Design a protein around this nucleic acid. Structure first.
Ligand SMILES: [K+]
Ligand SMILES: [K+]
Ligand SMILES: [Mg+2]
Ligand SMILES: [Mg+2]
Ligand SMILES: [Mg+2]
Ligand SMILES: [Mg+2]
Ligand SMILES: [Mg+2]
Ligand SMILES: [Mg+2]
Ligand SMILES: [Mg+2]
Ligand SMILES: [Mg+2]
Ligand SMILES: [Mg+2]
Ligand SMILES: [Zn+2]
Lengths: 142, 62, 119, 76, 142, 65, 100, 59, 192
RNA sequence: ACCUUUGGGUUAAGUCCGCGAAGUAGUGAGAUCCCUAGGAUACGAAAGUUAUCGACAGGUGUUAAAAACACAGGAAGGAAGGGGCAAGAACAGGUCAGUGAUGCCCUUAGAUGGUAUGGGCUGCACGCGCACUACAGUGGUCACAGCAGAAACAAAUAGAAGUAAAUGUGAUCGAGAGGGAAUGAGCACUGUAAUGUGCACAGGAACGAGGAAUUGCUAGUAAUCGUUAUCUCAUUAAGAAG
């Protein structure tokens, strides 16, 4: 069954984030404490653990993609998902992508842990990454 | 002070005033013999009830 | 029924140095005799002096508006060079209705009503 | 005079005595009756709602509303 | 085969499809989420509104899945509400006596005709010489 | 024509060749009238907006709506 | 066995006549005959100002050319394909073939 | 601004003057009669004519 | 979630036993139509008295989508009024709905000033307002008072809504809307 | 010379109904055409598409005709909504810098003809027209979701074109933490050539809702919010056209 849809996103993304950090499965980019997520953003994130909320939300994008049986997700797709409206002085605001470097690092970390497999046209889940999510949800709803 | 008379509109006659904003109307008071002619400015339907401040001031032109 | 022929009959007569009036009158007769239900002819330029003008002629029925203009109306334009300048010629012809579809449309105009006779 | 960035002991004491018998109370009341800034009206109000001295009755987006000891709702 | 009907509901450029089926229990899913999990409350309010003018005993022993594409967040909720409304009437006409269909239809028609008929309203095309459908660019004199 | 230019490296002794890219108005002249302005380049037409409107009905374009 | 014949044309009346003619031919041979499939028309368009200079109220026109199309998918033997292809000439309609 | 006009009215009067034995109160009957008795190509015009014929008949 | 009963406003408020309490207004104030959320798309504006059939709190949220920048933000308006009803229900102790009804009743001016003179100069005179116009002006004034009050003041907007509506229902001088109703009626009388 | 005759009702329209020294056919209006909304018995085995059909002031109530309104059923109700086509006459209205369309005057190897390398068209005391961001809290910032018109997206470890945005929930900030103008030393991209564009860091101007005046807009309209496999286009949109 499509088990992921049974719980609310603003409870799931915070929940997994702790399981990640307590096992260090993803490691921060150099200068994560001062870098911005996009050229469209005004200031760096207010939470020091923003890198882990990215990791938690990336696995959610992949779980729902797997649930709906879509084509595999690309680095471009993820960059447009996290995009925003950039401020340009005296000109209309304009839609701009997220920066790729963060996303590339997360996907390469998850590859080394065996959580994400690279296909010829995108990235895909693996059995361990599915089962972690399954066993979390089964407690979390109860 | 809050004196008031309630009156029932029986007829409408003429669109009136600069730009045609008002309507000449015939009104009968609910608890007196008096029947008046008045100008009213909102949309009005026959059989409406309107609240007047005077029972005497009149628009004789009718 | 071909406006592109008649306009070249007109253009010829200008070079033959014949009055526009006589030339146009002849053209209209040819168009009507061949069965056209009407036509329009306009000549424009330095036609009778230093001040330019245009002269327009109408005969019979001509349609200007809507889809019935695209199926019944035919047009041509040409110009003749003379010592004083260029004179422009416009011709338009309204085709006859034709039940075999050779000379013009099979179906008559969309707005015409005809009521059948009784036995 | 400008607003303040502490709730000193004697302001704290009298606020407890004042919050009972008040009905609906909100961020502004603490900041417009007493001299506290918005950033210290939030923190004190959140504290009293953990202590069961007040009770929260709405929290939709940032708009947040509370009730004291002489509140009473409608009845069917 | 299991008793079923299918209906379609439209608002602006949003289109929705509802499938309705026999069940031991009342069940409703939208975007694969139940009413107690779904992330937009305007949708949930518009669903529970129509579910109360129809009697609860008329929605008993029945299951629903709603899918939708196009339009935007407010328009899709009304599109979904029409698709849901037409399913119950369709099922009653096909699988029960026709008097109960007529009874239910009087109640919905008394409440809101736009629950069973679609608004033919759409955006008007832009013309030249103005920013939008009717507004003109600014004329000047001196 | 794709023209070519010589250029020297920093030594001012070794030479290499580079190609000039065809861009701008210089090769996109109107096919009816040689004009450089208002050329419609879509659908591999290369015809100016003045010339287009007189020939459009011969090509087969129509104003439906 | 199978053939798919694309009749492509920038005139509607012609394509309607030629398809009716070919449909009649199909039903007269009676190989379990069927209608053509009406395809999504290709539409190429241009938008331009009317005046040859800057003067006046800027008025604009949209010209669009429509390429209609109809597909027949059909069952025939190779002789009947070779012989019937004699039908597919002297048309303003352009005609194309696919086979398996 | 829904006025039948001179073409429609002329045709309608010719119809009632000659087919009165075939018409009734009903628009749907009257339209079947004009679809037979007349050559009206435009869909909008045959509705205008049949509507005008019913009104004349009842007068 | 919260309830499985009958339809209540915001799922909270009773929606019954409601009185207008001015016979001049009766037909023009819809407190009949049971709706869970003050939102409808019902297309009545294209009709002769269809804007008088729209429900009361609906008319009241529409009044908030103003000052230019807030055009179209109808969700925001609902969020705002929801909170105000909590403040009011608490403060007053009665169905927020009867506060809103009484605010309208008091805040509409009964007599007004207008140009009457046709066949000459236009001379101003008093005139008498219809039922429908009277309520249209009431909403306008209640809204305008709220907007301008909040502009550069530290207080929260839902709180200002509760301040004005109570006072208006109670006919106090404290209401911006009530004061301006007195002004219009005094000037009308001056030109009588 | 010229007029076709008494100016009463109706429509958007000499559109029509009355009445007449006038009467008959036409152009213009309407009809037709194109798009948007409803409709398989056709086609397909994929789940859609297209459709010669459907509305006529037709029904009831309003006591000459033509008409209009108020209800009612109906996908759709008063030109169904929106475009497109579109009389006669005019104007010394605009364009010879669109044209191997063109009369006449002028120049024509020291060219007013071509070509090449550079510079200007982009200069700045100042008066005007049209647009774009604003003056905050019905706000700012962080993160998370999530939805178009439909379907095209090598790779990228700070960052250096792309598949919405308003918006939804939680935090935060607290009354010039609103605002981004002039400017510094940099880091890349397009190009034959930067003067053009992108990016990071500093810097932080006026402006606290606008005098006399003035411009559009009646419903999916105005206003708000983004987007162009549309046009310009090597690179450039604060412009049009969707
Ligand atoms: K001319
Ligand atoms: K202008
Ligand atoms: Mg900003
Ligand atoms: Mg015509
Ligand atoms: Mg007109
Ligand atoms: Mg006559
Ligand atoms: Mg027309
Ligand atoms: Mg001139
Ligand atoms: Mg210049
Ligand atoms: Mg700032
Ligand atoms: Mg330009
Ligand atoms: Zn050209």
């Amino acid at each position: 069954n499509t088990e992921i849809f049974k719980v609310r996103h603003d409870t799931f993304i915070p929940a997994l984030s702790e399981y990640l950090r307590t096992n260090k499965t993803v490691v921060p980019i150099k200068n994560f404490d001062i870098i911005k997520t996009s050229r469209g953003k005004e200031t760096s994130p207010l939470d020091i653990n923003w890198y882990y909320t990215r990791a938690a939300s990336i696995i959610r994008k992949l779980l729902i993609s797997k649930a709906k049986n879509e084509k595999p997700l690309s680095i471009v797709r993820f960059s447009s998902e996290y995009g925003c409206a950039k401020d340009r002085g005296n000109r209309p605001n304009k839609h701009v992508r997220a920066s790729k470097g963060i996303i590339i690092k997360i996907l390469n970390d998850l590859q080394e842990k065996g959580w994400v497999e690279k296909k010829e046209n995108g990235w895909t889940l693996k059995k361990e990454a599915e089962e972690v999510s399954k066993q979390l949800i089964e407690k979390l709803i109860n | 002070s809050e004196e008031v008379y309630i009156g029932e509109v029986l007829q409408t006659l003429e669109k009136t005033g600069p730009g045609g904003g008002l309507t000449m109307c015939q009104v009968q008071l609910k608890d007196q013999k008096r029947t008046l002619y008045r100008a009213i400015m909102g949309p009005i339907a026959v059989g409406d009830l309107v609240a007047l401040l005077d029972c005497e001031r009149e628009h004789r032109r009718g | 029924l071909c406006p592109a022929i008649q306009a070249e009959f007109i253009r010829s007569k200008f070079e033959e140095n014949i009055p526009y009036r006589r030339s146009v009158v002849s053209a209209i007769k040819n168009i009507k005799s061949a069965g056209g239900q009407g036509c329009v002819i306009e000549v424009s330029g330095k036609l009778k002096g230093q001040r330019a003008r245009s002269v327009k002629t109408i005969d019979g029925k001509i349609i200007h508006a809507g889809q019935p203009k695209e199926e019944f109306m035919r047009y041509a334009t040409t110009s003749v060079l003379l010592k004083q300048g260029i004179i422009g010629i416009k011709v338009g012809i309204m085709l006859p209705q034709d039940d075999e579809g050779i000379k013009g449309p099979v179906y008559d105009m969309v707005d015409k009503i005809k009521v059948l006779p009784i036995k | 005079v400008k607003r303040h960035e502490r709730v000193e002991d004697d302001i704290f004491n009298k606020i407890v005595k004042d919050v009972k018998n008040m009905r609906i109370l909100t961020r502004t009341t603490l900041s417009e009756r007493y001299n506290l800034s918005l950033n210290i009206s939030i923190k004190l109000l959140r504290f009293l709602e953990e202590n069961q001295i007040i009770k929260l009755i709405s929290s939709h987006r940032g708009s947040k509303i509370y009730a004291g000891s002489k509140y009473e709702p409608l009845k069917v | 085969s299991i008793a079923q009907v299918i209906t379609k509901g439209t608002r602006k450029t949003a289109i929705s499809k509802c499938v309705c089926s026999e069940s031991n229990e009342f069940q409703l899913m939208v975007d694969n989420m139940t009413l107690d999990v779904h992330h937009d409350n305007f949708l949930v309010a518009k669903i529970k509104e129509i579910m109360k003018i129809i009697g609860y005993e008329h929605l008993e022993n029945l299951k629903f899945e709603l899918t939708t594409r196009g339009g935007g967040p407010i328009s899709r909720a009304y599109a979904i509400r029409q698709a849901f409304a037409k399913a119950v009437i369709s099922y009653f006409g096909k699988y029960y006596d026709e008097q109960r269909k007529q009874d239910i239809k009087e109640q919905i028609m008394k409440f809101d005709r736009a629950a069973l008929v679609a608004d033919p309203r759409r955006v008007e095309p832009k013309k030249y010489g103005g920013p939008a459908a009717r507004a003109k660019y600014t004329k000047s004199y001196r | 024509m794709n023209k070519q230019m010589i250029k020297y490296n920093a030594d001012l002794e070794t030479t290499f060749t580079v190609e000039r890219k065809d861009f701008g108005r210089t090769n996109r002249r109107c096919r009816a009238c040689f004009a450089y302005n208002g050329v419609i380049r879509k659908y591999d037409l290369m015809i100016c907006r003045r010339c287009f409107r007189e020939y459009a009905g011969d090509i087969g374009f129509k104003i439906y709506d | 066995i199978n053939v798919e014949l694309r009749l492509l044309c920038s005139n509607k009346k012609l394509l309607s006549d030629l398809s009716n003619r070919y449909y009649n031919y199909l039903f007269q041979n009676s190989p379990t005959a069927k209608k053509p499939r009406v395809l999504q028309p290709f539409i190429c368009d241009v938008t331009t100002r009317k005046s040859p200079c800057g003067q006046g109220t800027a008025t604009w026109s949209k010209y669009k050319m429509i390429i209609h199309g109809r597909m027949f998918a059909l069952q025939m033997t190779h002789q009947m394909l070779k012989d019937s292809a004699a039908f597919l000439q002297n048309t303003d309609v352009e005609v194309r073939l696919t086979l398996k | 601004g829904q006025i039948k006009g001179k073409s429609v009215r002329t045709a309608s009067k010719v119809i009632v003057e000659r087919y009165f034995n075939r018409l009734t109160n009903d628009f749907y009957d009257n339209r079947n009669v004009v679809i037979d008795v007349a050559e009206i190509r435009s869909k909008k015009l045959r509705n205008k004519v049949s509507g005008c014929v019913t009104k004349l008949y009842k007068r | 979630t919260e309830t499985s009963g009958d339809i209540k406003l915001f799922g909270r408020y009773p929606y019954t036993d409601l009185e207008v309490k001015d016979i001049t207004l009766e037909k023009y104030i819809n407190v009949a139509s049971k709706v869970i959320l003050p939102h409808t798309s019902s297309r009545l504006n294209t009709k002769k008295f269809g804007r008088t059939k729209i429900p009361v709190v609906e008319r009241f949220v529409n009044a908030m989508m103003r000052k230019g920048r807030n055009n179209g933000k109808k969700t925001l308006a609902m969020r705002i009024v929801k909170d105000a009803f909590f403040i009011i229900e608490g403060v007053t102790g009665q169905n927020p709905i009867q506060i809103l009804v009484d605010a309208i009743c008091n805040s509409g001016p009964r007599e007004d000033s207008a140009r009457i003179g046709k066949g000459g100069v236009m001379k101003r005179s008093s005139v008498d307002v219809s039922p429908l116009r009277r309520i249209n002006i009431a909403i306008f004034l209640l809204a305008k008072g709220v907007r301008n009050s909040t502009f550069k003041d530290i207080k929260m907007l839902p709180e200002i809504i509760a301040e004005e509506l109570i006072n208006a229902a109670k006919n106090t001088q404290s209401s911006f809307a009530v004061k301006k109703k007195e002004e219009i009626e005094r000037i009308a009388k001056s030109n009588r």
